[PDB]
Design a protein around this motif. Structure first.
Motif, PDB file in Angstrom:
ATOM      1  N   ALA A  63       0.852  -1.204   0.000  1.00 53.66           N
ATOM      2  CA  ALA A  63       0.000   0.000   0.000  1.00 53.66           C
ATOM      3  C   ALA A  63       0.876   1.237   0.000  1.00 53.66           C
ATOM      4  N   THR A  64       0.353   2.294  -0.570  1.00 48.69           N
ATOM      5  CA  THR A  64       0.905   3.654  -0.424  1.00 48.69           C
ATOM      6  C   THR A  64      -0.108   4.513   0.353  1.00 48.69           C
ATOM      7  N   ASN A  65       0.202   5.799   0.453  1.00 40.99           N
ATOM      8  CA  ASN A  65      -0.771   6.788   0.954  1.00 40.99           C
ATOM      9  C   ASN A  65      -2.048   6.756   0.094  1.00 40.99           C
ATOM     10  N   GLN A  66      -1.979   6.246  -1.146  1.00 45.41           N
ATOM     11  CA  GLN A  66      -3.142   6.147  -2.082  1.00 45.41           C
ATOM     12  C   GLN A  66      -3.894   4.827  -1.909  1.00 45.41           C
ATOM     13  N   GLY A  67      -3.431   3.963  -1.006  1.00 46.96           N
ATOM     14  CA  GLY A  67      -4.028   2.660  -0.665  1.00 46.96           C
ATOM     15  C   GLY A  67      -3.293   1.475  -1.283  1.00 46.96           C
ATOM     16  N   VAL A 104       5.414   3.883   1.362  1.00 49.07           N
ATOM     17  CA  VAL A 104       5.064   2.489   0.961  1.00 49.07           C
ATOM     18  C   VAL A 104       5.045   1.629   2.208  1.00 49.07           C
ATOM     19  N   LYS A 105       4.025   0.775   2.333  1.00 46.28           N
ATOM     20  CA  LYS A 105       3.966  -0.078   3.519  1.00 46.28           C
ATOM     21  C   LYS A 105       3.472  -1.448   3.146  1.00 46.28           C
ATOM     22  N   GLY A 106       3.820  -2.433   3.956  1.00 43.10           N
ATOM     23  CA  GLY A 106       3.180  -3.761   3.894  1.00 43.10           C
ATOM     24  C   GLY A 106       1.948  -3.773   4.803  1.00 43.10           C
ATOM     25  N   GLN A 107       0.907  -4.467   4.389  1.00 39.60           N
ATOM     26  CA  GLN A 107      -0.314  -4.638   5.181  1.00 39.60           C
ATOM     27  C   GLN A 107      -0.734  -6.084   5.131  1.00 39.60           C
ATOM     28  N   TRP A 108      -1.568  -6.495   6.066  1.00 38.86           N
ATOM     29  CA  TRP A 108      -2.097  -7.867   6.096  1.00 38.86           C
ATOM     30  C   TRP A 108      -3.559  -7.865   6.546  1.00 38.86           C
ATOM     31  N   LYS A 109      -4.245  -8.959   6.272  1.00 35.17           N
ATOM     32  CA  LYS A 109      -5.703  -9.144   6.501  1.00 35.17           C
ATOM     33  C   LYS A 109      -5.968 -10.629   6.675  1.00 35.17           C
ATOM     34  N   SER A 110      -6.805 -10.989   7.621  1.00 34.92           N
ATOM     35  CA  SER A 110      -7.093 -12.400   7.912  1.00 34.92           C
ATOM     36  C   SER A 110      -7.826 -13.055   6.740  1.00 34.92           C
TER      37      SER A 110
END
Lengths: 131, 131, 131
Positions: A63-67, A104-110
């Motif tokens: 994800a970025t600041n733009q999602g 820029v970031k890493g994200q996670w979701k179950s």
């Protein structure tokens, strides 16, 4: 410096029905004075596992600041695995910084209510390219 | 040339309680006159398998002359899998060459006594970045 | 621009006893005026699955106009998995453009008659390096 990196060795175990930041997996692009060109971003989570009652797994995103710009998942092939084995995961995306990217970031979701486990090395990497 | 690569198509099958070099997965950074800046290193073992009696798997590492910089593993989700399926594995790490790096190598280590199998393509890649 | 990328979110489901192009995963190197140096190519298929009757899986390859340069596979560890879980896959290869490379593509091939499934993000990325 055209190489950016962030790495972690753990995160608090959590569940999430939405994409949530993986703490520490964050690159500050604005702070680096990078305002144009492209980034090749790699999210590398080599040793994750998911705990759950219903074919567990983890969605990961860049994800970025733009999602979210890219995502994917691993899932187990058994309703409740004998042991929730280590399922290596890599995600690669290329983003235009010019379009207004500042982080820029890493994200996670179950997947299906899974608890999400990182207890060893994981990285978020970027290479900056300009014409 | 800022791109370095080494690739193999097999290695002798071995067990190891410690990290041991994967023969052929070696980049000679000193020999390339690279003494400063950063390397983004990718260890790519797309088609490994482990044989064992107790939830088998393989730990992989990226190491320099200074030792391991990053590691991770895959493991199966069954005590003795029906078939020990192919478990793609990638590891990504960024290292400061300035700190005294002269080579980069891939290494592996058994999970619970597993024999370690590469019988097809595997690579170790690096991109050199300088400010 | 030394960063090239192509991405898709799906492909028609097919079986194949041979390597066949994954539609959309194509980089046109000639069209970019790149005639010399090296490319580090990443094929990233983070969320594939295979359907079949006999330990299913998918072979993936990186190919040029000169054919396959690197390949690998994932396979399940059960003859007919309970559910055909999502099996992240990455492949990394470094090719000499000088040798006459004009395009790079991702390809896939069935394991044991498997139908091949991409229904979410997948990418083909390259970084161009010159001495």
């Amino acid at each position: 410096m055209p190489l950016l990196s962030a790495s972690i060795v753990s995160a608090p175990v959590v569940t999430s029905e939405t994409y949530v930041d993986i703490p520490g997996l964050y690159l500050d692009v604005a702070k680096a004075g990078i305002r144009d060109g492209k980034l090749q971003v790699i999210l590398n989570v080599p040793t994750p596992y998911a705990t759950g009652n219903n074919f567990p797994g983890i969605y990961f995103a860049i994800a970025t600041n733009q999602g979210v710009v890219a995502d994917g998942c691993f899932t187990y092939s058994s309703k409740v695995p004998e042991s929730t084995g280590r399922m290596p995961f890599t995600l690669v995306a290329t983003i235009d910084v010019g379009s207004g990217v500042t982080f820029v970031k890493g994200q996670w979701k179950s997947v299906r209510g899974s608890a999400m486990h990182i207890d060893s090395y994981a990285s978020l990497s970027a290479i900056w390219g300009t014409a």
